Coordinates of C-alpha atoms in Angstrom, one line a residue:
Chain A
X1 CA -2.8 12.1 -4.7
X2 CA -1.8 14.5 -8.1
X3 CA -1.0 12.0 -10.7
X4 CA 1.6 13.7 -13.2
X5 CA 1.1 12.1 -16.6
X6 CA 4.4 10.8 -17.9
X7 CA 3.7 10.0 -21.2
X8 CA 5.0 13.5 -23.0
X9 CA 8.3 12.4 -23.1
X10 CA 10.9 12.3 -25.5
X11 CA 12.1 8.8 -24.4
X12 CA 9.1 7.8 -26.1
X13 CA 9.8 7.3 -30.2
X14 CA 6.5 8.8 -31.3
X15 CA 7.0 11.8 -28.9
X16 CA 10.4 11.8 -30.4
X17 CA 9.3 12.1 -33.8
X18 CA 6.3 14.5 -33.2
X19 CA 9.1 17.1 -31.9
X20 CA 11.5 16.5 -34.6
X21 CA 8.4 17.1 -37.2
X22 CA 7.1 19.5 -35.0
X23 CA 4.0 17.9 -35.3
X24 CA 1.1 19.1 -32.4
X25 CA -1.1 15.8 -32.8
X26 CA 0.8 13.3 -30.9
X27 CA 1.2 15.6 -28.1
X28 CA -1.9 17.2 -27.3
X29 CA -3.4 14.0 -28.2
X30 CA -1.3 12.1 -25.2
X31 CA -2.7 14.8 -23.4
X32 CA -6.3 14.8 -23.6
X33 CA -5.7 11.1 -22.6
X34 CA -3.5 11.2 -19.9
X35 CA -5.9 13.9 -18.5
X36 CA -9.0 11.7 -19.1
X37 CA -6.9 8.8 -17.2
X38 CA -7.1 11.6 -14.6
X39 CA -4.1 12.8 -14.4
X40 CA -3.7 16.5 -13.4
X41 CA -0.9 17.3 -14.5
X42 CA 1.5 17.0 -17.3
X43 CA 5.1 16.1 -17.2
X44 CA 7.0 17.2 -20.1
X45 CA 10.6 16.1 -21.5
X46 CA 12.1 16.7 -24.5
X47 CA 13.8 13.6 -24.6
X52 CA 17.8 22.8 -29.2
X53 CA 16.1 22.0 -26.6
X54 CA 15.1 25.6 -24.9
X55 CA 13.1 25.6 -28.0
X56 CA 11.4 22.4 -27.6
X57 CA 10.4 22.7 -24.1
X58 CA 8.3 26.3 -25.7
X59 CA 6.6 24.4 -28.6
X60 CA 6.2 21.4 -26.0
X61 CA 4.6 24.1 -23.5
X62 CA 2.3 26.2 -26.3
X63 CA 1.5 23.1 -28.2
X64 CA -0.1 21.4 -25.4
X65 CA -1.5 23.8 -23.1
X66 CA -3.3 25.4 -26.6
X67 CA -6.1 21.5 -26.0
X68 CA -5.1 21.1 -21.9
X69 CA -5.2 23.0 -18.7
X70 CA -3.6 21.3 -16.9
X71 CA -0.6 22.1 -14.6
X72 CA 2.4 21.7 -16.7
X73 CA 5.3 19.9 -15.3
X74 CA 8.6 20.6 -17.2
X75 CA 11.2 17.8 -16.7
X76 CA 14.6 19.0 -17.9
X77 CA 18.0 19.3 -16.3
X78 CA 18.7 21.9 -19.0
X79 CA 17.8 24.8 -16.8
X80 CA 17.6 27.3 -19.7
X81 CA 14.8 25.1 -21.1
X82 CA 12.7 25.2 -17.7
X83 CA 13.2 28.8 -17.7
X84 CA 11.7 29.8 -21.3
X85 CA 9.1 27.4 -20.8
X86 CA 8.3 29.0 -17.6
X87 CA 8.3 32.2 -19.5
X88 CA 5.5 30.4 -22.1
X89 CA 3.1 28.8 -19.4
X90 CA -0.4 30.1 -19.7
X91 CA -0.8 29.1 -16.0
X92 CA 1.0 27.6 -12.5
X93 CA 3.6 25.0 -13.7
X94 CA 5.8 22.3 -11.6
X95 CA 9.7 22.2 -12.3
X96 CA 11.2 18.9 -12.6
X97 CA 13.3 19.1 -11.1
X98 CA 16.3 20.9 -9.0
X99 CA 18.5 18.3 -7.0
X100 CA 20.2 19.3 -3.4
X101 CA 23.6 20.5 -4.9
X102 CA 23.8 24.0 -3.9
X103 CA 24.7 25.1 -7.7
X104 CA 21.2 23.9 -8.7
X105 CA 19.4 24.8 -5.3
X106 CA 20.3 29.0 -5.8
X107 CA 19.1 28.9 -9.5
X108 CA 16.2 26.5 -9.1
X109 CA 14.8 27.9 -5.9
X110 CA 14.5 31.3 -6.9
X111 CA 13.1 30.5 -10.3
X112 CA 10.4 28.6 -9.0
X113 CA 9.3 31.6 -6.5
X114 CA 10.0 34.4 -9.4
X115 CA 7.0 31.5 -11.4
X116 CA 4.9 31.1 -8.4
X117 CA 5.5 27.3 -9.5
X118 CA 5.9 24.1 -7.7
X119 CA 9.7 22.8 -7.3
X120 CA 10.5 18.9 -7.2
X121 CA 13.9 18.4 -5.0
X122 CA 15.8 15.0 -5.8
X123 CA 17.2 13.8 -2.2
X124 CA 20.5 13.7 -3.8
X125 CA 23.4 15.6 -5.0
X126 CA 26.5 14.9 -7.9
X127 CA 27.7 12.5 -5.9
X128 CA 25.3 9.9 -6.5
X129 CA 21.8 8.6 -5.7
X130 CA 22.1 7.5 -1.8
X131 CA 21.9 4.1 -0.1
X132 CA 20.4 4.4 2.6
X133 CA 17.1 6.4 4.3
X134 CA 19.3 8.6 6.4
X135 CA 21.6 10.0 4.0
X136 CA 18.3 10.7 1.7
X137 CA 16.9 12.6 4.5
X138 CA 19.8 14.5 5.3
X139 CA 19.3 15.7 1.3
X140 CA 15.6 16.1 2.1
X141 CA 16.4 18.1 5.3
X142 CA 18.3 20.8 2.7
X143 CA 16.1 21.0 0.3
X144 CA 13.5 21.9 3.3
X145 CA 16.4 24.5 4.4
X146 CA 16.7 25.7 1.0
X147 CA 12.9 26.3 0.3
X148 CA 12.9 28.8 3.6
X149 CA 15.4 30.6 2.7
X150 CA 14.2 31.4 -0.5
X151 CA 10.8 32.1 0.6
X152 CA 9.4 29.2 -1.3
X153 CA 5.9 28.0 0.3
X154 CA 6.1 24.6 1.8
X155 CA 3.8 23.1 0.7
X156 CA 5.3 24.0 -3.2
X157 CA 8.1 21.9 -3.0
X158 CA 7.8 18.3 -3.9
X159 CA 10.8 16.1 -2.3
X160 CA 11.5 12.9 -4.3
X161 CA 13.7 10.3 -2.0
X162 CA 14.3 8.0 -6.0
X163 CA 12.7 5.2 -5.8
X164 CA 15.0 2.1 -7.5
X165 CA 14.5 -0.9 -9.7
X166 CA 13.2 -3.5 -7.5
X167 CA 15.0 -6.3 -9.6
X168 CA 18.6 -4.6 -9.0
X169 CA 18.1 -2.6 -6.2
X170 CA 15.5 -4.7 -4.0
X171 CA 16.6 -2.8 -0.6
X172 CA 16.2 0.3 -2.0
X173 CA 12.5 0.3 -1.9
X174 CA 12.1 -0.4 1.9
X175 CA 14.8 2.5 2.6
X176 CA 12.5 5.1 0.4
X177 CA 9.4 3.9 2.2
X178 CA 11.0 5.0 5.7
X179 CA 12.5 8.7 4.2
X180 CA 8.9 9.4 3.3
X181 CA 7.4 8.2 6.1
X182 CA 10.3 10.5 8.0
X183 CA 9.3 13.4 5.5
X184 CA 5.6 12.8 6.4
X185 CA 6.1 13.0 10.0
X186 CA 7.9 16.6 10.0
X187 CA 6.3 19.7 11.7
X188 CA 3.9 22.0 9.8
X189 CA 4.1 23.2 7.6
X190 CA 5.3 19.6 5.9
X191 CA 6.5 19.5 2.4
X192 CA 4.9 17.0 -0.3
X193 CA 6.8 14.5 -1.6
X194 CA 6.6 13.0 -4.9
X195 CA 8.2 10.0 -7.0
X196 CA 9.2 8.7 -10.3
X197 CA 7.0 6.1 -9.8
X198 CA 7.5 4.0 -13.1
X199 CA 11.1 3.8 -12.4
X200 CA 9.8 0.7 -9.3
X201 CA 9.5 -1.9 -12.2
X202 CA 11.8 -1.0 -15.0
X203 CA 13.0 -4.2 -16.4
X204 CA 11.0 -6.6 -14.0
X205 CA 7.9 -8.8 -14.8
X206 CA 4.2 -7.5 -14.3
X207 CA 5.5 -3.8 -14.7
X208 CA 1.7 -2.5 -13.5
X209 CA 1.4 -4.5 -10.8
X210 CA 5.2 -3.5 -9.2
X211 CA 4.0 0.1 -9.9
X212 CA 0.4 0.1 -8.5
X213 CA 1.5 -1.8 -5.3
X214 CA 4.5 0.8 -4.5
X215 CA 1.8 3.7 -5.3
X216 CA -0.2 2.5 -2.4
X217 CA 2.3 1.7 0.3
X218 CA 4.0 5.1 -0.5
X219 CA 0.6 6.7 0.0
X220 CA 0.5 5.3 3.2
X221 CA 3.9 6.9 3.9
X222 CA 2.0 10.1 2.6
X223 CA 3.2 10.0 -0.5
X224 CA 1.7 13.3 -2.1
X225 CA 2.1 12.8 -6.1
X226 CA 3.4 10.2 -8.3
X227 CA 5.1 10.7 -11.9
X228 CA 3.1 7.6 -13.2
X229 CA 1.2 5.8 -16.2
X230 CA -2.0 8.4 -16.3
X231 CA -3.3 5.4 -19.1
X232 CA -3.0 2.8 -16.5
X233 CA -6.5 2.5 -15.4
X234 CA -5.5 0.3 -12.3
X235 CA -2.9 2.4 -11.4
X236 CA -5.6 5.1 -11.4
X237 CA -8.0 3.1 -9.3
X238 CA -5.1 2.4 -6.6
X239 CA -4.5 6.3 -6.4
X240 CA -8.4 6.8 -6.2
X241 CA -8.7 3.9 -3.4
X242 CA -5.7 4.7 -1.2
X243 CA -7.1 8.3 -0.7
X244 CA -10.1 6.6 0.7
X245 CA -8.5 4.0 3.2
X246 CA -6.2 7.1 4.4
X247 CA -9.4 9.4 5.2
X248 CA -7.9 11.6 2.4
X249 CA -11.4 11.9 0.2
X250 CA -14.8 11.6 1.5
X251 CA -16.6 7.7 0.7
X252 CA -18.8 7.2 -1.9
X253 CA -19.3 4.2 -4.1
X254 CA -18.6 5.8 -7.7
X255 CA -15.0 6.8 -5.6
X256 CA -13.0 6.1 -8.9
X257 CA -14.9 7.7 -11.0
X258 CA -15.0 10.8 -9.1
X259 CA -11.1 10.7 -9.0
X260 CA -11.1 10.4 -12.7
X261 CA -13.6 13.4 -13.1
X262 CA -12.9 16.3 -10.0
Chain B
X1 CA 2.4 -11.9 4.3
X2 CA 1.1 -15.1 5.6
X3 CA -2.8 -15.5 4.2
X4 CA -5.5 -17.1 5.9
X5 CA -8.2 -18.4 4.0
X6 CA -11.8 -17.4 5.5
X7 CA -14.0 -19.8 3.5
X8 CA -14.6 -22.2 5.6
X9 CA -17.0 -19.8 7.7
X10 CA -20.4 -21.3 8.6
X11 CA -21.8 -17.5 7.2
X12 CA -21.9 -19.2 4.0
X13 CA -24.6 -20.8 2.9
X14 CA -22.9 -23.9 1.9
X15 CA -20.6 -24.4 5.0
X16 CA -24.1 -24.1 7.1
X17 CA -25.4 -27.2 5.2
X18 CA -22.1 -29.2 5.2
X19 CA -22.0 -28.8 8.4
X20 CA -25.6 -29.6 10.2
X21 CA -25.6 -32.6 6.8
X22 CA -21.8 -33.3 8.5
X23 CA -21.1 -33.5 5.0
X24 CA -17.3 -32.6 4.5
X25 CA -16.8 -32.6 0.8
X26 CA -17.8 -29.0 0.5
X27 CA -15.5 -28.3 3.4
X28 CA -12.7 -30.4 2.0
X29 CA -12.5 -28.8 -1.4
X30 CA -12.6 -25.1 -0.2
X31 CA -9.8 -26.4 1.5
X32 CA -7.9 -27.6 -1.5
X33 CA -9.3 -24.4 -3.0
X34 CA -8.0 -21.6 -0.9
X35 CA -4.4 -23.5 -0.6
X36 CA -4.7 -24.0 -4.4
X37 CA -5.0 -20.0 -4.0
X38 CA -1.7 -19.5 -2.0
X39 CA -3.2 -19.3 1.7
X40 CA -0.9 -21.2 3.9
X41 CA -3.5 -20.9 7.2
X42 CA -7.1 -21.6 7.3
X43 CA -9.8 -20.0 9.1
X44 CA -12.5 -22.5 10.4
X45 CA -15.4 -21.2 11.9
X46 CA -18.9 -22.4 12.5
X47 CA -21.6 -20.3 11.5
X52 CA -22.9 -28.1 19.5
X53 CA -20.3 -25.2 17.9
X54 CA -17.9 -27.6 20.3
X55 CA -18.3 -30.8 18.3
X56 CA -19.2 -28.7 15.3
X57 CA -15.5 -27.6 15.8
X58 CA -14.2 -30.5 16.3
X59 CA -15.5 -31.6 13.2
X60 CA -14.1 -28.5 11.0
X61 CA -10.4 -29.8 12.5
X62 CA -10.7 -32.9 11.7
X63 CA -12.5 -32.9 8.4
X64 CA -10.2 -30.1 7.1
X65 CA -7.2 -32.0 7.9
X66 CA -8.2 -34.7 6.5
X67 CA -7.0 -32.4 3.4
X68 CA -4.6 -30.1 4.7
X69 CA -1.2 -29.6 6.4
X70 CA -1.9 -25.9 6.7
X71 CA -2.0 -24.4 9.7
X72 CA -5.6 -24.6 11.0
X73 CA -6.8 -21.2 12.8
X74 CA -9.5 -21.5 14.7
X75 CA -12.1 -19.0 14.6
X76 CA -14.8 -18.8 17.6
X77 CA -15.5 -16.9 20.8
X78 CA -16.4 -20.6 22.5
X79 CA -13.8 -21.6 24.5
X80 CA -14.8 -24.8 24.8
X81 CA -15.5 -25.1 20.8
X82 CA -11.3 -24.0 20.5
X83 CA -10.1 -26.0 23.7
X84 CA -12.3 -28.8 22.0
X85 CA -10.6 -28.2 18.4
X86 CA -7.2 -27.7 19.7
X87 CA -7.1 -30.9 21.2
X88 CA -8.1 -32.6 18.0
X89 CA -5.3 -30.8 15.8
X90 CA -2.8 -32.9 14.2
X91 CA -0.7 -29.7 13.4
X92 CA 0.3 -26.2 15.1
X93 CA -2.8 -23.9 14.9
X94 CA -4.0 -20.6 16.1
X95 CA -6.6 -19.3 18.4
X96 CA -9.2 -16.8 16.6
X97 CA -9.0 -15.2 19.0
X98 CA -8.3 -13.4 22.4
X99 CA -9.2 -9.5 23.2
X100 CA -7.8 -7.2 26.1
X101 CA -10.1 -8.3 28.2
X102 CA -8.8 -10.2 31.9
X103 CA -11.4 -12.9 31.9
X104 CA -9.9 -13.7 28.7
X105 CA -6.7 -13.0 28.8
X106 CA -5.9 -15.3 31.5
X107 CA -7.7 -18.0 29.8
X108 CA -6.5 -18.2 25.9
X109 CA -2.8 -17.3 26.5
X110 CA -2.4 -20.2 28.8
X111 CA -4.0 -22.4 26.3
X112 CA -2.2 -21.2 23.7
X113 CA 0.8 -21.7 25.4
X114 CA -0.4 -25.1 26.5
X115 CA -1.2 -26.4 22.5
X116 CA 1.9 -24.4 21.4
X117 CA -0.4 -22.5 19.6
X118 CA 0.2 -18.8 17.8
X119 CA -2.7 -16.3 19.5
X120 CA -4.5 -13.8 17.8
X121 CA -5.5 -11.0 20.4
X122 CA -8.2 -8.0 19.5
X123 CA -7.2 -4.6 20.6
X124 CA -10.1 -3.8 22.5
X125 CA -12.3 -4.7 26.0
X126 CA -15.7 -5.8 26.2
X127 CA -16.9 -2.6 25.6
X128 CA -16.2 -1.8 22.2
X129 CA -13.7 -1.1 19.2
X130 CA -11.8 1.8 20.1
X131 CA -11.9 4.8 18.4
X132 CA -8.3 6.4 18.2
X133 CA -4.9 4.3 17.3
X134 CA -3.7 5.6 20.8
X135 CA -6.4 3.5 22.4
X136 CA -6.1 0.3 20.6
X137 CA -2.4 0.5 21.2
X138 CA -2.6 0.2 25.1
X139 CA -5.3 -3.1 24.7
X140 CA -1.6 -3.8 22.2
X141 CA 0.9 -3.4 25.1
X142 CA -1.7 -5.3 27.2
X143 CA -1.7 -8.1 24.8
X144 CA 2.7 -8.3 25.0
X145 CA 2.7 -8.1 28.7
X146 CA 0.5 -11.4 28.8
X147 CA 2.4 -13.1 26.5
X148 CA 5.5 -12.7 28.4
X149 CA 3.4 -13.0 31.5
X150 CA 2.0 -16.3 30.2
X151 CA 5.2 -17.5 28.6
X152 CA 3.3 -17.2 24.8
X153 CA 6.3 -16.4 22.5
X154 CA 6.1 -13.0 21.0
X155 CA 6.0 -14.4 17.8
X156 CA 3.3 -16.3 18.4
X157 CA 1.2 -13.0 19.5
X158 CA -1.0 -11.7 16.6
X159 CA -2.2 -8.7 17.4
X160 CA -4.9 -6.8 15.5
X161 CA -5.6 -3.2 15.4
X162 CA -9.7 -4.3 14.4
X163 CA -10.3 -2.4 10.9
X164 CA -14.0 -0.9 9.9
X165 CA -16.0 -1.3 6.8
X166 CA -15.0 2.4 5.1
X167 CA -17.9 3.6 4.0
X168 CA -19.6 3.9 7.4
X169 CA -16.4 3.9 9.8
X170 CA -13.8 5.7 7.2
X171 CA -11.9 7.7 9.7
X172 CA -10.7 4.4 11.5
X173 CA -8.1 3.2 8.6
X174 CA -5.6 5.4 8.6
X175 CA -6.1 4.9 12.4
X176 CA -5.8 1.1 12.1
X177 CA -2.4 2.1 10.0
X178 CA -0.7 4.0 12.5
X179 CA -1.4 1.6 15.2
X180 CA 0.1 -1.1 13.0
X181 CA 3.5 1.2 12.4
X182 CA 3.5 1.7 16.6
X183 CA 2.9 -1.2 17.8
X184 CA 6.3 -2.5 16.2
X185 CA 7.5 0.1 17.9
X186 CA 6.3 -1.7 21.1
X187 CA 8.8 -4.4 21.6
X188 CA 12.0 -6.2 20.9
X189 CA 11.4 -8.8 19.7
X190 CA 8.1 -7.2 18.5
X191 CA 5.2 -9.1 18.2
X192 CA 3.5 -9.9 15.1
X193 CA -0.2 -7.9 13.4
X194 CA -3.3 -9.2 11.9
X195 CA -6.3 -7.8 9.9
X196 CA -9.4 -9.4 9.0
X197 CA -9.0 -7.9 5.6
X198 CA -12.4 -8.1 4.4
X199 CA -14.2 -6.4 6.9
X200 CA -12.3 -3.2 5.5
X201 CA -15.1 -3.4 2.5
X202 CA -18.1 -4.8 3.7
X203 CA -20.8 -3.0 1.9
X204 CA -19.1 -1.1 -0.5
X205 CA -18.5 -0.9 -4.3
X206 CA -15.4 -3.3 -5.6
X207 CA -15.0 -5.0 -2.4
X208 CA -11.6 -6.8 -3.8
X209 CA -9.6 -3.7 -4.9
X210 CA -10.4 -1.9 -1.4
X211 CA -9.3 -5.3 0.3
X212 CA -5.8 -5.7 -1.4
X213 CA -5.5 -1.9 -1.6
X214 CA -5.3 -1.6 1.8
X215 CA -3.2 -5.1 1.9
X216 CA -0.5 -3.6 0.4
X217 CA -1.0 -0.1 2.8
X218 CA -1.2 -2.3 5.9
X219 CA 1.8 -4.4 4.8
X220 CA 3.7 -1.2 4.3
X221 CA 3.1 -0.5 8.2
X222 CA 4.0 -4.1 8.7
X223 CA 1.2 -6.4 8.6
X224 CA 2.7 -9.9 8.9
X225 CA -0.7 -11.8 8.3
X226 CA -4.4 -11.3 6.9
X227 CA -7.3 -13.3 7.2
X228 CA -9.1 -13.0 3.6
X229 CA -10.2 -14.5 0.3
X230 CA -7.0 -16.4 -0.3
X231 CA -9.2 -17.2 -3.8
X232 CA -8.8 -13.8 -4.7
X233 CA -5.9 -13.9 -7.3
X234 CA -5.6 -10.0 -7.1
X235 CA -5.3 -9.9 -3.3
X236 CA -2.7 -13.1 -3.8
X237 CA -1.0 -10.9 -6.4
X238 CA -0.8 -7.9 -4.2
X239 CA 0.6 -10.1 -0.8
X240 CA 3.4 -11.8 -3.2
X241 CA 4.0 -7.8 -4.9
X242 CA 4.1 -6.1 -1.5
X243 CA 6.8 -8.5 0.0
X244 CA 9.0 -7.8 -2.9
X245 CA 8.6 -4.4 -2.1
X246 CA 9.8 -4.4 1.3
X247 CA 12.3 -6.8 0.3
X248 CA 11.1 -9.3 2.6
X249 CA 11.4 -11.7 -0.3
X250 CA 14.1 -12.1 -2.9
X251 CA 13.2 -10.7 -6.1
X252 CA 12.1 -12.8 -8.9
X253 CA 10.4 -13.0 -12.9
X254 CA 7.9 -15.4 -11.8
X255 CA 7.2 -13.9 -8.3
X256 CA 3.8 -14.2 -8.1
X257 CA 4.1 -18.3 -9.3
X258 CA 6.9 -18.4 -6.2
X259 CA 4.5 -17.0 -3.3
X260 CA 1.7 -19.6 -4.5
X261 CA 4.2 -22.7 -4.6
X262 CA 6.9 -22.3 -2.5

């Protein structure tokens, strides 16, 4: 399980500051700790923003190397960021409307990165499992025609609020259990995992429960809480109980460490 | 996610004494403890296992209304504890075996009792999920055969500790996700829970890791430490996840007390 560290974002009003000020410290300070969570990745967001996404990039691969995962829908941004990435990076993300799939697609393979596909398109985020995987199905379509590897594209069926969208969560258990049972190569599939508990009581606990049962549905990454020790151990355990990573008994702090 | 408390199990040191002493208050306040915990069945086993039994039944529902489920490979020792039941139980337990078979389901029946039936023969546990799912059809032809309701069948796939036997959970998962996939009506899945740690390192978060896991791939019921406010955390989390439960601030107050 690649834990992707959501805290470099924008959203966030010290994040939103340290951009505004340009100041380095709150940023590659989130990242040292997200990484020493165990994350091993780093999402960023810049909450001029082709600028931003450059500084965020230098600033905080110049303390981390850790993949860098650039959340934008300003494709410009992805693009010079791409350009300033010391190493393999993860876009965040391209969804299944053709407009973005021809730009996004080919960008990622010109970057040798990682592509994360939103099982959706303008119309709106889908109800159900099938029409998800029908946007899944494209996005699989997509990657093979544009000679992106398989196993580089990440598909994310949205996981909902589980206060205002209870039946939701069910329905994206099944697409990536679907997604998990396709024929080699399969494609990974990620989520926005926070997202599971937004305004809902015992925010951790909604979050690290969903991590495992997605896992089980072979769920392959998770845009989480890197600072959320728990959520951590979960991700560390569930690769155990699915033969994923060899037993021992220090399991979570090897997850933590490798 | 119905729990089953596993206290009352003559293993422990203090169920051994209360027992041979036929002293019941240490039975009797497990009992109030592990309902206390949210458990809404109790496992009652032994450690004369006939009148020893017998004694179990009646002691613990001197306390409790919860189903009793009643743990022992003595025939006799359930046949004898059945009788004495003042509410619905269930027999712990049956395996694929004829001798067997042909035996429990009838009494089951007979008592109007739910049947918990072990996806192996005599022999041993299986090693694949493709094995322990034919002992699972096995199981559902005898409780049609037999007249058991199918929701009375509890059928478990027989998880291993997973530091010696790893390879068997994800095993033990996808025979869970099948074996829905047996029947319509299907029938319903068990786990002793515990036995998924038994020597390792933080027994509790393996247990309600793979809680929420097996849940995800169905799992209606779990025999386990019902005073484990973590694993009751994680049953009461999970359910809301699935949406098997309405959502809810105070869900984990609501699968305690309702």
């Amino acid at each position: 399980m690649l834990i992707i560290g959501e805290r470099i974002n924008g959203m966030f009003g010290d994040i939103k500051r340290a951009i505004q000020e340009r100041d380095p410290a709150p940023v590659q300070e989130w990242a040292r700790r997200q990484e020493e969570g165990g994350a091993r990745a780093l999402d960023l967001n810049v909450g001029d923003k082709v600028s931003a996404m450059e500084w965020l990039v230098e600033v905080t691969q110049e303390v981390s190397n850790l993949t860098l995962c650039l959340d934008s829908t300003n494709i410009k941004a992805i693009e010079a960021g791409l350009k300033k990435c010391k190493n393999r990076a993860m876009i965040n993300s391209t969804n299944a409307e053709r407009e973005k799939v021809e730009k996004l697609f080919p960008l990622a393979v010109e970057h040798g990165a990682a592509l994360i596909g939103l099982t959706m398109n303008k119309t709106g985020i889908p109800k159900d499992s099938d029409t998800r995987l029908a946007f899944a199905m494209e996005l699989v379509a997509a990657a093979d025609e544009f000679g992106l590897p398989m196993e580089d594209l990440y598909i994310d069926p949205l996981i909902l609020p589980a206060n205002v969208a209870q039946d939701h969560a069910p329905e994206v258990l099944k697409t990536l259990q679907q997604i998990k049972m396709l024929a080699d190569p399969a494609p990974k599939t990620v989520l926005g995992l926070s997202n599971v508990s937004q305004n809902c009581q015992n925010r951790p606990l909604i979050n690290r429960t969903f991590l495992a049962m997605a896992m089980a549905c072979g769920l392959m990454s998770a845009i989480a809480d890197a600072c959320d020790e728990a959520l951590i151990e979960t991700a560390a355990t569930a690769e155990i109980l699915l033969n994923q990573t060899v037993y021992c008994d220090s399991f979570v702090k090897m997850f933590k460490t490798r």
